[PDB]
Design an enzyme around this catalytic site. Structure first.
Site, mmCIF file in Angstrom:
data_model
loop_
_atom_site.group_PDB
_atom_site.id
_atom_site.type_symbol
_atom_site.label_atom_id
_atom_site.label_comp_id
_atom_site.label_asym_id
_atom_site.label_seq_id
_atom_site.Cartn_x
_atom_site.Cartn_y
_atom_site.Cartn_z
ATOM 1 N N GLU A 11 1.773 11.951 8.774
ATOM 2 C CA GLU A 11 1.832 12.576 7.443
ATOM 3 C C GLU A 11 2.525 13.470 7.262
ATOM 4 O O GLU A 11 2.964 13.723 5.946
ATOM 5 C CB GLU A 11 0.638 12.616 6.861
ATOM 6 C CG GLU A 11 -0.280 11.155 6.687
ATOM 7 C CD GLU A 11 -0.137 9.503 6.346
ATOM 8 O OE1 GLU A 11 1.167 9.891 4.886
ATOM 9 O OE2 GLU A 11 -0.649 8.887 6.575
ATOM 10 N N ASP A 20 5.624 9.517 -1.846
ATOM 11 C CA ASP A 20 5.683 8.118 -0.408
ATOM 12 C C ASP A 20 6.547 7.706 -0.312
ATOM 13 O O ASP A 20 7.620 6.874 -0.856
ATOM 14 C CB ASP A 20 4.385 8.113 -0.061
ATOM 15 C CG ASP A 20 3.642 6.851 -0.785
ATOM 16 O OD1 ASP A 20 4.596 6.237 -1.676
ATOM 17 O OD2 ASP A 20 2.538 6.753 -1.421
ATOM 18 N N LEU A 32 -2.955 10.210 -1.736
ATOM 19 C CA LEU A 32 -2.380 10.236 -2.576
ATOM 20 C C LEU A 32 -2.350 10.314 -3.672
ATOM 21 O O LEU A 32 -3.879 9.692 -4.170
ATOM 22 C CB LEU A 32 -2.829 8.312 -2.246
ATOM 23 C CG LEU A 32 -2.647 7.065 -3.960
ATOM 24 C CD1 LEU A 32 -0.662 7.326 -4.320
ATOM 25 C CD2 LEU A 32 -2.319 5.609 -3.183
ATOM 26 N N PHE A 104 -6.785 5.357 6.476
ATOM 27 C CA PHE A 104 -5.867 6.772 5.957
ATOM 28 C C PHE A 104 -5.133 6.098 5.056
ATOM 29 O O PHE A 104 -4.897 6.612 3.946
ATOM 30 C CB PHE A 104 -5.745 7.270 6.706
ATOM 31 C CG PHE A 104 -5.039 9.450 5.982
ATOM 32 C CD1 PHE A 104 -4.322 9.300 5.845
ATOM 33 C CD2 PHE A 104 -6.144 10.554 5.871
ATOM 34 C CE1 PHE A 104 -4.005 10.754 5.115
ATOM 35 C CE2 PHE A 104 -6.066 11.217 5.336
ATOM 36 C CZ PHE A 104 -4.154 11.708 4.312
ATOM 37 N N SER A 117 -6.782 -9.709 13.948
ATOM 38 C CA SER A 117 -6.470 -7.731 14.712
ATOM 39 C C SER A 117 -7.782 -7.540 15.334
ATOM 40 O O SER A 117 -7.846 -7.004 16.700
ATOM 41 C CB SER A 117 -5.425 -6.688 14.796
ATOM 42 O OG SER A 117 -4.094 -7.598 13.928
ATOM 43 N N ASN A 132 -0.037 -9.066 17.889
ATOM 44 C CA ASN A 132 -0.284 -9.175 15.987
ATOM 45 C C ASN A 132 0.200 -8.484 15.163
ATOM 46 O O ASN A 132 0.215 -8.057 14.747
ATOM 47 C CB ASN A 132 -1.850 -9.786 16.223
ATOM 48 C CG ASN A 132 -2.993 -10.755 14.797
ATOM 49 O OD1 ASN A 132 -3.039 -9.579 14.475
ATOM 50 N ND2 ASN A 132 -2.080 -11.741 15.080
#
Ligand SMILES: [Cl-]
Ligand SMILES: [Cl-]
Length: 162
Positions: A11, A20, A32, A104, A117, A132
């Site tokens: 990040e 972002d 965010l 996250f 998955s 996948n």
């Protein structure tokens, strides 16, 4: 290496409101703020999150504090999610970190949607899950990051972050 260091690498850290990868207002370590186009709305959410008039600027300590809250919230989100919890409980410590990273980034709902998955991960079919996982918008939009997380699930080591 641990979840904090991992996410810090993925990040970055910015002490001012920024946009972002999706063009949404964010601050600190991937926190965010809002999906709204309004900078004002973003400043408003930042102030409310920090508890002061920030003027869109925060300190390192403030960023880290939001970060700790967000990591905690992701973990708590996974444990309360009926689809995620079983997966998480089945994994080893390194792979758990990989699942936290996805939550996250895209939220609990988003990850819970990776049905196939998730089942593959629960079954410990590493290579298959990795393939996948790559068939997704996530991988196509943020391929370098997706590759790091995918390798992490594939190998169970931190090699992609070293
Ligand atoms: Cl908050
Ligand atoms: Cl990327």
């Amino acid at each position: 290496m641990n979840i904090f260091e991992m996410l810090r690498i993925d990040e970055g850290l910015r002490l001012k409101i920024y946009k972002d990868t999706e063009g949404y207002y964010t601050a600190g370590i991937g926190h965010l703020l809002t999906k709204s186009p309004s900078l004002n709305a973003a400043k408003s959410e930042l102030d409310k999150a920090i508890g002061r008039n920030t003027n869109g600027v925060i300190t390192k300590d403030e960023a880290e504090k939001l970060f700790n809250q967000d990591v905690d919230a992701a973990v708590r989100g996974i444990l309360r999610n009926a689809k995620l919890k079983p997966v998480y409980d089945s994994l080893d410590a390194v792979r758990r970190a990989a699942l936290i990273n996805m939550v996250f980034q895209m939220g609990e709902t988003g990850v819970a949607g990776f049905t196939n998955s998730l089942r593959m991960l629960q079954q410990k079919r590493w290579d298959e899950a990795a393939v996948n996982l790559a068939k997704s918008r996530w991988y196509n939009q943020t391929p370098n990051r997706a590759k790091r997380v995918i390798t992490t699930f594939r190998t169970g080591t931190w090699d992609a972050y070293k």
